[PDB]
Design a protein around this ligand. Structure first.
Ligand SMILES: CC(=O)N[C@H]1[C@H]([C@H](O)[C@H](O)CO)OC(C(=O)O)=C[C@@H]1NC(=N)N
Ligand SMILES: CC(=O)N[C@H]1[C@H]([C@H](O)[C@H](O)CO)OC(C(=O)O)=C[C@@H]1NC(=N)N
Ligand SMILES: CC(=O)N[C@H]1[C@H]([C@H](O)[C@H](O)CO)OC(C(=O)O)=C[C@@H]1NC(=N)N
Ligand SMILES: CC(=O)N[C@H]1[C@H]([C@H](O)[C@H](O)CO)OC(C(=O)O)=C[C@@H]1NC(=N)N
Lengths: 387, 387, 387, 387
């Protein structure tokens, strides 16, 4: 039967490590796909780790150009959480260089975008097969979440973006029951930009903390109602959470407009807590090093910069990167509330390191109502490989 | 319980990519069987990719002579769609260098032909074991579909051919419930030739688009009724769909007789649409390069050459090859109609390339009611391998 | 629920190939256990291939001494029929250098013998764990079937031998419900010898065609009743079926006494057909080359040498070896009778070939009521390996 | 539904080999994790082998420093008993360099401790996800069982230790239903020390045979009641069972105080039998060589040194090491009593051997009411590896 996911998010004080896959380290000798954009989604029987292969394996000649971002070889697959993206445990999901996924209690729903950049198409899947499609509507990279979409009482919603990586673009929400689309919406956000949102269910509504790739060093936020009515803005916080980003002291929070002088970013996330918010980010303000998460007092509703809880999961001497959200189903956590969790992508090799390849590993952290000590659960691989 | 498969085929406007396995690319380092003749069949829980191994793996000394077509080592196996034909996820089906397969809602039914060429035998399997057999009846390669057979309301039917690859041969239809044969038929087609049919269910009857290897550059078509009464001919179309084949301008369609001056071919397919038809084919008229599919107006009932929908899934700079059909069960697509899909085999190495081996990869496309943009989702492997 | 297996054996006219694993060929590059003594047993959901690893893999330094027969490393494992004995699909059964196995409709029952030769012990397993044991009772290699034991209406019976490989030894039957022994019997056979029986169910009684390693070039036969009352002798046939063995022309059949001047043998099998019998054997009378099976008219009840059905599954230019029996459950074949099948072990490397290792592959043939043409489905490996 | 596990332990006369994994031997060529601290726990469907990887595989550069004990890479995983800890069959449990696990009839419960040593944290898991946590409470390695915890009628209990490896430390018991903690206890044991207990269910109470790392060459024992009331002491026996340990002749048993002049040890176990006890141990009193188990008459209640049953499972010419307990569920053994079993860890390479790596293999022995002959089922690997 169907999953409700209508409870608010639980109020945690810290996150405990769920898993760690050791994708890369294990790949020096194992048969592991070369990937990127990994994320985590859960059903009422298990959580799985979805990723985007490069139709190749680590420590092999085919892992060469693996930095480009797109190719016809990129395919969306998955494996039980914590397990590495190896070839022998992989479940084929779909053909994509940009995906998202979520389960609604009964079956999984996947969306893999692939094809030419001026005419890419999104193949929606449900129950082991594609059921519906969405063609690029602005002829210019029809991307998406690169993270767990969201299902509430049977209806699963997600976000998509067609446009430049810089200047203004076009966004849209998507709502669908059992793999068949059922209406969507065009996000009005002139001057504001949005990409790869790390959503999650909360209070019977969908909340996302996306990524402005145009001008914002602060992230845009967006609450989606079931009838497609929505709200869009930016984490109010007085602290920046993008990368690259200006300093905490030189940044002024903003609930409606983007801020900071930076035209590039990185996927990221944030959880709503009362009017408070837990916001993740890479410690090193310029590169993709280390990963830290912060709970600014009142941050979701005020421009607050009042900190009172900080914990590192990746120190600044370790490659980090992407990081999305998702929740544990009540049919697993057992809580009376949606336990919030997130993952951290730990990229390696190019661009940052001298290697002919690029890939990443992931680490899964999870709510809990106990303050967790700072530590580093970094990749570990010894670069370069048998290159 | 049993599957009906009595609904007509849905009327699509284009096909969206279901999966891609990256068999070869992944094999440069992985443990993947060396194969050929792959295809796709689906049950009410999943679609699987069936293939014919060579009892060996890529990038190994045993992948040597792998071009011959037949050996006692060739065995029919399968893996969830999109997954590569690796050794660790393979499901043993049967011993064969020529197979077909289909599920009837409850269990799978496989038929693997193997043995000497003048006395080969077909072992029929059902539920993990052989139940019935069919011995060669003309002492001369007892081949078959090399594609998904067809089950309607419990009875599964398929096609077989015993004879020369050229001059006239002997064909026969086959109908069977739960793995036990139950009557069959000899196809009368003097002057006309048939091999490896890419059938599918439609309107409570079975339709196949086979391959004349004798003289036809246009494919033969055949509608099988449940009582074994049938119809046999050639796609009426005024456009050739075999390889090698003469030009579109120099070809005259034919609903009853084969045409064109060519004594060799390749497996292929076609879907009925009203009186219209979607016909697949390799773009390059002589070699096994690129793959394109066309919807000629009225083509299934008239000698029409009226085009009004063309989409490439493999441009002409990429090795292609075989391509068969099959349908998605209503217990998966959810449609009220049999969603039509097909796969494309992408061969590599010998004969076309300087390698001691030969194998292929596959790509799965699927109905949908949206016109899909042209693209190439080609093999990708870097030949030669660690040869 | 429980399996009856009380129906007679079906009367076939030939056997069709079920599967072929390509263990060795695939091992040149794959991760396959180095094994020996493989066999086949089936439950009402699937047949599996049981074997004895050497706690090592092909094409590795540990596959060295792998000829000895016994070590503390030898462990009994299995994999779906036709699948190779690779490490990633293997199911651990038990610790042994001599096993047997069978399912009784509900769970599997395994018996792995291991330990010192003068005090070896048999660990009986049932449902994923050992339930009962049988200690060596004559301090001298406590071996067993090396083939599928037999279960009838819940009670599973098998055979064991403690003694020299030559001169007289001690045998015993074993009957047990759900993994717990329940009485057994000492076979009286002075002058007669018995080892590794290839039994099967028939007419509510158990029939085995074992191996005299002392003096018989003809095999001993033994019918086990449910109350442990039994019958013991030798295939009556006027044709020898052991290896080494004297010529067909110089052999005189014998229903009660062993015959021929040979003190060594090989595992083998035979099926009862009316008073007729299908008897398997290696074609080459001295070595372990080729495999043939024969249906001598009346052979099971008379000293007959009347042949009228012969089919080779391995020509005499191909290494062969062991071969045991077993039946397909009615809950799989669908027949109203126990379809008889058997497997053929194809050994390689030492002793016969110049290699530091020894192992084998298997081939599964199965009843059917159609006369099957002679062919060779031999190993295939290219020796030596990356040695 | 829930598991009772309230029956006493069965009274065996010997233990029969359940399985053997051949982890290391197989790893010379296979893809096996490099591990340590392996153990065995069982549910009412199967027993599984839990271990602690090093986020790497054997015969690879990453298996280097693998001796340290702790890293952020260490993750707790498992595989069906007897199966090696290979990457393709591994089930991710949690992130840890110190774990324990047990099933309560419905789902599994795992606890993985990881993080800094002065602030480590324990993530409790249940049903594929962490549900509750326990932070280090003495800032100094928050370790645990490294063996199967214990569940009785739904409530699962285990033991933890925070302190120095030498001088006095702090212990505590833990009781929890469905992954959520529910009260615990601080063990009062001044002068006495406890670590990595090898518990098991017996008489509706929990009994553990731990390891004093401070001063005891005799092991401490502890009976846990359901209301957390408990008893703590040392195996009464007049024979030492730790390593290093003084001689049997120079040792005087002790039911309340530790004895012997040794400040280091090794994990170990013991089973209660009447007032008798089966105690395991490494034969060689100083190193980690061989493994033997002894049943001293009355040993659990008296300082007895009365032996009358000894059996070796690893002779003193073979590396051995850790060894924990656990029981077979009645829903598997079928007995009316909790069949007692245990495993033996066979370490290899560093520190004892000249290798850049360290890891181990395991062997599983199991109750039974038959006296089992002495033998060696040692590792087998040929060191060094392709180093
Ligand atoms: C479709 C595509 O190529 N998406 C890109 C993404 C995108 O480039 C930016 O979001 C700007 O729009 O950037 C990044 C990135 O790491 O910055 C990875 C993505 N790679 C993949 N999703 N495969
Ligand atoms: C049984 C057999 O050898 N079949 C051949 C097939 C056949 O040769 C032609 O259809 C003419 O009859 O050709 C081809 C081919 O690629 O042209 C592949 C097949 N290989 C395999 N099915 N293994
Ligand atoms: C227990 C044992 O070592 N059994 C031997 C077996 C036996 O040697 C003869 O049957 C004489 O008794 O011979 C053979 C053989 O191939 O001749 C293989 C067996 N190897 C294994 N079962 N592992
Ligand atoms: C947490 C930790 O590092 N535990 C150590 C353990 C400990 O060191 C002693 O018990 C003293 O407290 O010793 C040993 C050991 O083999 O002596 C292995 C353990 N390694 C692992 N559990 N990973």
């Amino acid at each position: 039967t169907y999953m409700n996911n209508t409870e608010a998010i639980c109020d945690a004080k810290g996150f405990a490590p769920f898993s760690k896959d050791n994708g890369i380290r294990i790949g020096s000798r194992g048969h592991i796909f070369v990937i990127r954009e990994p994320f985590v989604s859960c059903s009422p029987i298990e959580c799985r780790t979805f990723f985007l292969t490069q139709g190749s394996l680590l420590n092999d000649k085919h892992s060469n150009g693996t930095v480009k971002d797109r190719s016809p070889f990129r395919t969306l697959m998955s494996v039980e959480v914590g397990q590495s993206p190896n070839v022998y445990q992989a479940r084929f999901e779909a053909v994509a260089w940009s995906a998202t996924a979520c389960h609604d209690g009964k079956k999984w729903m996947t969306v893999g975008v692939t094809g030419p950049d001026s005419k890419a198409v999104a193949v929606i899947h449900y129950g082991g097969v594609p059921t519906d499609v969405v063609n690029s509507w602005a002829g210019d990279i029809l991307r998406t979440q690169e993270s767990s979409c969201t299902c509430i009482q049977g209806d699963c919603y997600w976000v998509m973006t067609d446009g430049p990586a810089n200047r203004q673009a076009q966004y849209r929400i998507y709502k669908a029951n059992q793999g068949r689309i059922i209406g969507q919406t065009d996000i009005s956000f002139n001057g504001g930009h949005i990409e790869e949102c790390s959503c999650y269910p909360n209070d019977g509504k969908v909340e996302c903390v996306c990524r402005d790739g145009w001008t914002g060093t602060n992230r845009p936020v967006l609450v989606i109602s079931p009838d497609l009515s929505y709200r869009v803005g930016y984490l109010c916080a007085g602290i920046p959470s993008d990368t690259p980003r200006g300093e905490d002291t030189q940044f002024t929070g903003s609930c409606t407009s983007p801020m900071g002088n930076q035209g590039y970013g990185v996927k990221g996330f944030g959880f709503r807590q009362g009017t408070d918010v837990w916001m993740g980010r890479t410690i090193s303000r310029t590169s993709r090093s280390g990963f830290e998460i912060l709970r600014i007092k009142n941050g979701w509703t005020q421009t607050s910069k009042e900190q009172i809880r900080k914990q590192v999961v990746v120190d600044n001497l370790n490659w980090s990167g992407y990081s999305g959200s998702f929740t544990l189903p009540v049919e697993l956590s057992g809580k009376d509330c949606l336990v919030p969790c997130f993952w951290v992508e730990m990229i390696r090799g190019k661009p940052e390191e001298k290697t002919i390849w690029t890939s990443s590993s992931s680490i899964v952290m999870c709510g809990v109502d106990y303050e967790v000590a700072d530590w580093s659960w970094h990749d570990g691989a010894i670069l370069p490989f048998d290159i």
